[PDB]
């Protein structure tokens, strides 16, 4: 397993087969797989050094770990992009020994530099990922080179975790399972050699090929992405508010000790005692319960303020903050969620230093139909489409049809303030009753950002009490079309900053 | 379905600790002994075994007088499940008053050897267990492939780390390994044996438990995996195990006729391409 | 507080303290079947580098354990490794009776040769001039590995 | 006291008490039942499955 | 018809079955369950009218 932690260095050596035994399409599969792997690894913003060595009858080095540019994602991506399949026409044999000896030469050159006795070299871990069919027909047995690799790093029983050799064969090409198993490192409780069919399965397997368990710093957005993980692992920021043994409103962790939730959950309660926030826990499946010490309600929120004018309910300024009385120990089951208009969101998007949230708004909501997700009652993740631009104008018009609740004309300027986002149109799901406050997030560069929280809607698909899982479907003839809404976080920056200026670092 | 055992015990160390013994033998991997024969042995007037206990593959005997000369007592066993693999079993004999004075002996199946075959020479003791190869006379019989009978075998499914064309001079035997002394005419491919060249002698070892044989005088082509043992002169020694390509090279005497000359052409194309080019594909 | 553990069907493996390399040994894992149903299992040892198993390494032996009984399986092995190995024996039952167990243990290999101890007794009396300073000669035995 | 050195060492003594010193050096050295004997012979036919190493 | 189901610790799992009766009287509905590595082969039989 490729260990992830804040201490040390991770030298990644990606070897790609470039022989006659792999065709051009298989080489494209290998290249896109390596691109995906190098993209995912850099998402954790750790110290990583990546070296690309496409190998054939002779070993050709495309980028050097010793080179100081190995700590840049775009440079490595561009260097891998310039790989050529025809560069090895003179020699089309598979020479695994050449690649392994090139890796050994790189490692020895690094060892001579900076001094072997220095702890900086001692704390370096290695990970060699070979994408090949394994049929190495010349140059010598891989065992000699592997033993040489072990001896240079003196990989004993105690230091067995400092060298990981993988052998992943992805594509239609025939793969000898025995050879791939022999090439991969032999460890007691994990698999190091795989055979696959496409790149999505490789993404899943690579998601299993890491362990963020040793990482416990306050990083936002980072979360699992494999489909075989628990529902809480995929959305660690999901926390829940329990008034009295009931499971009413959801939330999102925005810091070590803060939670952001809708303000209409705390309608008729000022006794913060007996209120418990359920937070995911690595051990128990029901989570650990925390106590809230300060609940802040937006002063501009008043449901019945426009009652006389004809607006039965107006959900403006529907936002609240919670401060747990105890610090949440970050783990693999609970991590914050990236909020925009802050330094960490800028860092997670790999944007220039001199950025402003005016650019963040366009970067994160450029499309006229931006995909987004929110968490269901049972913990699953659903899909919606936030609509901006001219497409937003048609959205609010549908509310005017619902004159049974507000008899007035109810145009966009009156009921649907600019603070709300569309959803629920065409092939889009709608939240049930009991999902208010749940983050409406979106994924960018393998990192999750929050761009709003559920506020209200026009149809509850959980009215039928079949189960907590079954969800009704709105009939096509259902007179009010489903048209949900979510408070937009960007418009609420003036309220956010003065309440969280010290906790975070806003732009 | 049944096999007859035989247990012989004696002592030549009467100076040391003496007395009685407990003969604990382990039957084969699936057999179990007959209780009737052991009961007949025990219920004798001049009984030789005074106590016994049979359970599955375990037989326990108590000898009350270990003699100085050979004294064999036998019984019978039946078979329950097939023997999944060839292996030698064990038979121990403890001293009654001091069980620390034991003697353990390995024994084998009615036709196999008592110890696992292993190629051992000085420090290296490379294993030689598995299957033994066949003498594939592909050229003599009629068959055809598109650079697949030998080039595929050398570059696609198995990876041959060495390949030579050799002449068989002398045949010999060494323990359980049949030895062939050969001389290398031309080197086709090598990885570790760099010192190999023309007019250099090599040794080929094959287990003497099967029918493989290399006739003297003839010229052969040898290809397979590189070994780990060395000869008495300090040169590498190769074991003719499975997944190894051995084939006698025709002398053109039985090839001049039209039918086999195409196969000979495919041969020469192979050897030339493999010798000149480094395992393409 | 006595606290006992049990499996009702398990593999027991007892390796010796150490074994000289290249010297043939026999492993005797025993299947214990304390269930009330007569069974049948297949037992094999996972091949690993440094061990010269019999048959190649991947073969398995069929052995049946009656109700409330035990059965041993013999595996001849000559350890040709250098320092140590980790051998694992797996027993897998049928789908009719879904039982099995796997045990992995480290087999240590001792260094070539034997242990030799040399003692040098030495009198000492600082009440005399001769004993005030003294010298210890080295060992020139050419049998040291 | 356990220790590890080469092949020459000197001893410097003080005090005024008789005693006995011992230097013990341990190192590796170069390397059929003796008295009790046993032999087992097997005769019969044994049936194997997927074991016979003879092809064809 | 056989289904392999994993039960979470300190929990329970419901396996639904569909039966349409085309005969009258009292008939037996039996489900056989065998646990893996726990030897438990408990199966329950009931009578449906």
């Amino acid at each position: 397993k490729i260990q992830i932690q804040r201490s040390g260095h991770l030298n990644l050596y990606l070897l790609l087969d470039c022989s006659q035994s792999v065709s051009e399409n298989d080489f494209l599969i290998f290249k896109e797989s390596a691109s995906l792997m190098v993209d995912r690894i850099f998402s954790f913003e750790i110290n990583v050094s990546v070296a690309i060595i496409t190998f054939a009858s002779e070993p050709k080095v495309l980028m050097s770990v010793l080179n100081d540019n190995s700590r840049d994602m775009t440079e490595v991506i561009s260097s891998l992009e310039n790989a050529n399949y025809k560069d090895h026409e003179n020699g089309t044999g598979t020479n695994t020994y050449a690649a392994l000896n090139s890796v050994y030469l790189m490692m020895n050159n690094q060892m001579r530099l900076l001094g072997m006795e220095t702890m900086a070299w001692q704390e370096i871990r290695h990970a060699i990922i070979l994408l090949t069919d394994g049929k190495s027909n010349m140059g010598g047995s891989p065992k000699t080179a592997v033993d040489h690799i072990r001896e240079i790093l003196n990989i004993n029983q105690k230091r067995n975790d400092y060298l990981d050799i993988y052998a992943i064969g992805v594509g239609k090409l025939d793969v000898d399972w025995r050879e791939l198993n022999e090439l991969g490192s032999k460890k007691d409780g994990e698999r190091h050699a795989f055979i696959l069919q496409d790149t999505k399965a490789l993404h899943q397997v690579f998601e299993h090929m890491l362990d963020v368990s040793k990482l416990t710093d306050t990083i936002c957005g980072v979360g699992n992405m494999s489909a075989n993980a628990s529902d809480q692992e995929r959305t660690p920021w999901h926390v829940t508010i329990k008034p009295k043994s009931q499971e009413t409103c959801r939330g999102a962790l925005i810091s070590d000790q803060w939670v952001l939730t809708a303000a209409h959950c705390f309608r008729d309660g000022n006794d913060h005692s007996l209120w418990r926030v359920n937070v995911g826990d690595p051990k128990s499946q029901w989570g650990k319960e925390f106590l809230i010490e300060k609940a802040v309600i937006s002063p501009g929120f008043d449901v019945f303020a426009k009652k006389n004018q004809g607006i039965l309910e107006f959900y403006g300024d529907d936002i609240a903050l919670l401060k747990l009385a105890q610090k949440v120990k970050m783990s693999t089951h609970a991590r914050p969620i990236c909020l925009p208009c802050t330094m960490e969101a800028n860092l997670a998007l790999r944007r220039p230093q001199g950025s402003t949230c005016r650019d963040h708004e366009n970067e994160l909501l450029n499309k006229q139909s931006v995909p987004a997700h929110f968490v269901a009652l049972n913990g699953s993740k659903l899909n919606i489409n936030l609509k901006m631009g001219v497409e937003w104008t048609s959205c609010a018009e549908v509310v005017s049809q619902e004159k049974t609740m507000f008899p007035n004309l109810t145009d966009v300027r009156e009921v649907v303030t600019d603070q709300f986002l569309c959803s629920g149109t065409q092939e889009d799901e709608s939240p049930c009753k009991g999902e208010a406050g749940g983050a409406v997030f979106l994924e960018r560069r393998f990192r999750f950002f929050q761009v709003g929280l559920v506020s209200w809607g026009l149809y509850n698909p959980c009215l039928g009490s079949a189960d907590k899982n079954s969800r009704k479907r709105a009939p096509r003839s259902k007179v009010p079309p489903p048209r949900d809404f979510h408070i937009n976080l960007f418009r609420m920056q003036p309220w956010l900053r003065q309440h969280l200026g010290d906790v975070l670092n806003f732009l | 379905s049944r096999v007859h055992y035989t247990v012989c015990i004696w002592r030549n160390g009467k100076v040391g600790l003496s007395g009685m013994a407990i003969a604990d033998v382990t039957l084969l991997s699936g057999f179990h002994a007959l209780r009737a024969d052991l009961e007949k042995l025990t219920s004798l007037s001049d009984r030789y075994v005074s106590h016994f206990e049979t359970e599955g593959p375990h037989v326990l005997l108590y000898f009350d007088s270990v003699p100085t000369s050979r004294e064999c007592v036998g019984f019978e066993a039946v078979q329950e499940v097939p023997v999944g693999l060839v292996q030698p079993a064990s038979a121990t004999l403890y001293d009654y008053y001091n069980p620390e004075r034991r003697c353990s002996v390995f024994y084998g199946a009615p036709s196999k050897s008592r110890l696992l075959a292993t190629l051992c020479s000085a420090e290296v003791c490379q294993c030689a267990e598995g299957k033994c190869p066949r003498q594939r006379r592909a050229l003599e019989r009629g068959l055809q492939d598109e650079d697949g009978y030998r080039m595929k075998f050398a570059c696609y499914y198995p990876r041959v780390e060495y390949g030579f064309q050799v002449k068989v001079l002398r045949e010999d035997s060494r323990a359980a390994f049949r030895l062939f002394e050969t001389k290398i005419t031309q080197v086709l491919h090598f990885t570790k044996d760099v010192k190999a060249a023309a007019n250099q002698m090599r040794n080929f070892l094959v287990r003497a438990s099967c029918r493989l044989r290399l006739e003297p005088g003839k010229e052969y082509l040898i290809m397979g995996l590189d070994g780990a043992t060395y000869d008495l002169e300090g040169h590498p020694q190769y074991l003719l195990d499975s997944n190894s390509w051995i084939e006698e090279m025709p002398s053109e005497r039985l090839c001049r006729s039209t039918r086999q000359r195409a196969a000979c052409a495919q041969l020469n194309d192979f050897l030339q391409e493999y010798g000149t080019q480094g395992c393409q594909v | 507080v006595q606290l006992r553990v049990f499996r009702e069907f398990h593999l027991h493996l007892r390796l010796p303290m150490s074994v000289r390399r290249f010297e043939q040994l026999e492993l005797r894992p025993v299947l214990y079947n304390y269930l009330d149903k007569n069974l049948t299992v297949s037992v094999h040892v996972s091949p690993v580098e440094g061990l010269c198993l019999a048959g190649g390494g991947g073969l398995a032996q069929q052995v049946l354990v009656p109700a409330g009984s035990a059965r041993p399986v013999a595996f001849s092995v000559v350890p040709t490794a250098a320092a140590a190995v980790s051998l694992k024996v797996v027993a897998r039952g049928s789908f009719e009776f879904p039982v099995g167990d796997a045990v992995s243990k480290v087999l240590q290999i001792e260094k070539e040769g034997a242990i030799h101890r040399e003692e040098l007794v030495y009198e000492l009396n600082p009440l005399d001039h001769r004993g005030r300073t003294l010298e210890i000669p080295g060992n020139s035995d050419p049998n040291m590995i | 006291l356990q220790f590890s050195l080469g092949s020459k060492i000197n001893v410097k003594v003080g005090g005024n008490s008789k005693g006995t010193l011992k230097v013990l050096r341990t190192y590796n050295v170069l390397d059929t039942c003796q008295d009790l004997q046993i032999e087992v012979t097997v005769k019969g036919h044994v049936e194997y499955t997927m074991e016979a190493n003879e092809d064809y | 018809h056989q289904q392999t189901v994993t039960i979470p610790p300190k929990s329970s799992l419901s396996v639904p079955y569909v039966i349409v009766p085309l005969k009258t009287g009292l008939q037996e509905v039996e489900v056989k369950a065998a646990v893996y590595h726990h030897f438990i082969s408990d199966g329950v039989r009931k009578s449906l009218k």
């Binding site: - | - | 297949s42 897998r92 099995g100 045990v103 | 049936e47 | -």
Partner: peptide
């Protein structure tokens, strides 16, 4: 083969825990 052989109808061998 004196008796029957139940080959490849056995447990997966991956779900059997390893005790070390």
């Amino acid at each position: 083969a004196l008796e029957i052989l139940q080959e490849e109808d056995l447990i997966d061998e991956d779900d059997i825990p390893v005790r070390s």
